């Protein structure tokens, strides 16, 4: 049967969805408890948050992981396995919106200075936030790539850590020197570009998956030579590779043979060699006689 | 050759990209001229816009249409043809953000009433906006579906038309009865739900394309019977259909044959019958002997 070699690709996926669900679930509880500490800390202090969207970011990334367990349907024939890639794009988009709003809020503070703020509250608030974010980063943190959902709930955690550094640095200089208060808002600006830089290597490895591009991990040239290693085959055209999710790849190609007879042996030999370089989700390979091959058609050009 | 029947699918696409580029280009010029009318209308009136994002919405939908003309590459093997689907998702997202901001702005006006506004400016501004939006809607406005880019620059145009109706109704009731000014803000609320309803039948026909779902236009059952019409074939398993863009579909299936000999005739017969029901972008069909078929494997279940 042609489904014999798919066990390895099926076995690994089941372990990764359970392992990633457990790790993300534990971190959600810590965030929920940490938020509750603000309310019980005080009334006036708690009256004056950013942690509200943290609950949403840790709910979408976990709710979307449940739909990936759904079965097939006459629509969405492959399945719901791409819900994690598309469900981890909204989380990264949320980082851009929150930073943009916070930058706009900081801009208003620059033109209109304020003095009602007190440094005592800032120091105690920064210390509590720094500890919670640092521990939450550690628990989230041929070799398979990282999951496409734990890689989108980790950039947000490191995003809030930088703001914690910025507020501590800004508050520290105020105590040492009360003057030059105009340099307080610019601390956010100098520590906001870094948040918009760390989200550039994620929004590229995740945007070539949503437009049928070859994922990181497999090389086009390596696969092309592997098929040609078989003595029976002659040439390959219209090779197609695309990634259904981050660590699942699919293959589809044409093969031209020299001898029409005993073509079943060629099909079995090619499949075994292809599967010896990567665990493929599925593979579909045609056979075409050499006498019908034509080189003048445009579609066979790379 | 196996590329003989792809001419029909290639010919139609070239015409649609040129026809859609011409229509969208003309509408952009009208919007640019219409915006310039506000500045030359007056100084104090022009000092006190929403049309700024209209230029961006009519630039992304046209700039993204250029990348779809790019050639293939060792990465993104299929091509850049899905840039229009992904480039028409940001335009719809922009509608949600603008409405949300405008709703928030209207909320502040409700709690804090204002009287500095004059109805004379509102009436003349609404009349000019209503005419420009109405004409722009008309020019944009087996049978192929509409393009995936003209269907995302048309929802925005009809989105601004409803706001033009709302401001005219709100201004009209003020002149008839200066009292009950608290009913002015609710006019926007009663005419903002409609904008968030008209963008629900678009964000569904466009989200099952980005997750390898069957598009509107082709039925799974119809294709399955078409292959089985051939006397040579016995059964089909692991049938896969997905849409690369809105009006381009791809097929991939397995076929089990009874007689090993003369298998080349079966491959040619199946391809002709499949192409007689829909113009397919590409088709890949395997052949598997009956003696190797096994029914106990789980992967052959629908
Ligand atoms: Zn099979
Ligand atoms: Zn955050
Ligand atoms: Zn060819
Ligand atoms: Zn071929
Ligand atoms: Zn608009
Ligand atoms: Zn099977």
UniProtKB/Swiss-Prot annotation, chains A, B:
Primary location recorded for the protein, binned into one broad class: membrane
One GO BP: zinc ion import into organelle
Entries under Pfam families matching the protein: Cation_efflux (PF01545)
Keyword Transport annotated: yes
Positions of Zn(2+) 3 binding: 1, 3, 297, 300
TM regions (residue ranges): 24-44, 48-62, 85-105, 120-140, 154-174, 183-203
Key word Endoplasmic reticulum present: no
Reactions mediated catalytically: Zn(2+)(in) + 2 H(+)(out) = Zn(2+)(out) + 2 H(+)(in)
Molecular function via GO: metal ion binding; zinc:proton antiporter activity
Motif interval(s): HCH Motif: 1-3
Entry's localization field: Cytoplasmic vesicle, Secretory vesicle membrane; Cell membrane
Topological category with respect to the lipid bilayer: Multi-pass membrane protein
Residues where Zn(2+) 4 binds: 81, 281
Alphabetical list of NCBIfam families matching this protein: CDF
Family classification: Belongs to the cation diffusion facilitator (CDF) transporter (TC 2.A.4) family. SLC30A subfamily.
Subunit structure: Homodimer.
Comment field (misc): Each subunit of the homodimer independently transports zinc ions in a pH-dependent manner. The cytosolic pH promotes binding of zinc ions to the transporter binding site. Upon change into the organelle-facing conformation, the two histidines of the zinc-binding site get protonated at lumenal lower pH, triggering zinc release into the organelle. The transporter then moves back to the cytosolic-facing conformation where the two histidines get deprotonated at higher pH, resulting in a net antiport of 2 protons.
Protein name: Proton-coupled zinc antiporter SLC30A8
């Amino acid at each position: 049967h042609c489904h014999n070699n798919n066990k390895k690709a099926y076995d690994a996926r089941q372990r990764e969805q359970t392992f990633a669900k457990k790790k993300l679930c534990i971190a959600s509880l810590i965030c929920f408890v940490f938020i509750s500490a603000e309310i019980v800390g005080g009334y006036i202090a708690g009256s004056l948050a950013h942690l509200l969207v943290d609950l949403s970011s840790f709910f979408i990334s976990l709710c979307s992981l449940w739909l990936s367990s759904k079965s097939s349907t006459t629509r969405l024939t492959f399945g719901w396995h791409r819900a994690e890639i598309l469900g981890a794009l909204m989380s990264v988009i949320t980082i851009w919106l929150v930073t943009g709003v916070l930058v706009y809020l900081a801009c208003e503070r620059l033109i209109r200075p304020d003095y009602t703020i007190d440094g005592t509250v800032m120091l105690i608030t920064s210390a509590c936030a720094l500890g919670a974010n640092l521990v939450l980063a550690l628990i989230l943190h041929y070799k398979p790539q990282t999951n496409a959902s734990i890689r989108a709930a980790f950039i947000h955690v490191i995003g809030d850590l930088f703001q914690s550094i910025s507020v501590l640095i800004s508050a520290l200089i105020i105590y040492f020197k009360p003057e030059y208060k105009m340099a307080d808002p610019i601390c956010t600006f100098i520590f906001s570009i870094f948040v918009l830089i760390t989200t550039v290597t994620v929004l590229r490895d995740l945007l070539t998956v949503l437009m049928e591009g070859t994922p990181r991990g497999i090389h086009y040239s390596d696969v092309k030579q592997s098929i040609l290693a078989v003595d029976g085959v002659k040439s390959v055209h219209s090779l197609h590779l695309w990634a259904l999710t981050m660590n699942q790849v699919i293959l589809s190609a044409h093969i031209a043979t020299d001898i029409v007879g005993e073509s079943k042996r060629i099909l079995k030999d090619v499949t075994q060699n292809v599967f010896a370089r990567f665990p493929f989700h599925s593979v579909t390979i045609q056979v075409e006689p050499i006498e019908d091959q034509s080189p003048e058609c445009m579609f066979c050009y790379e």
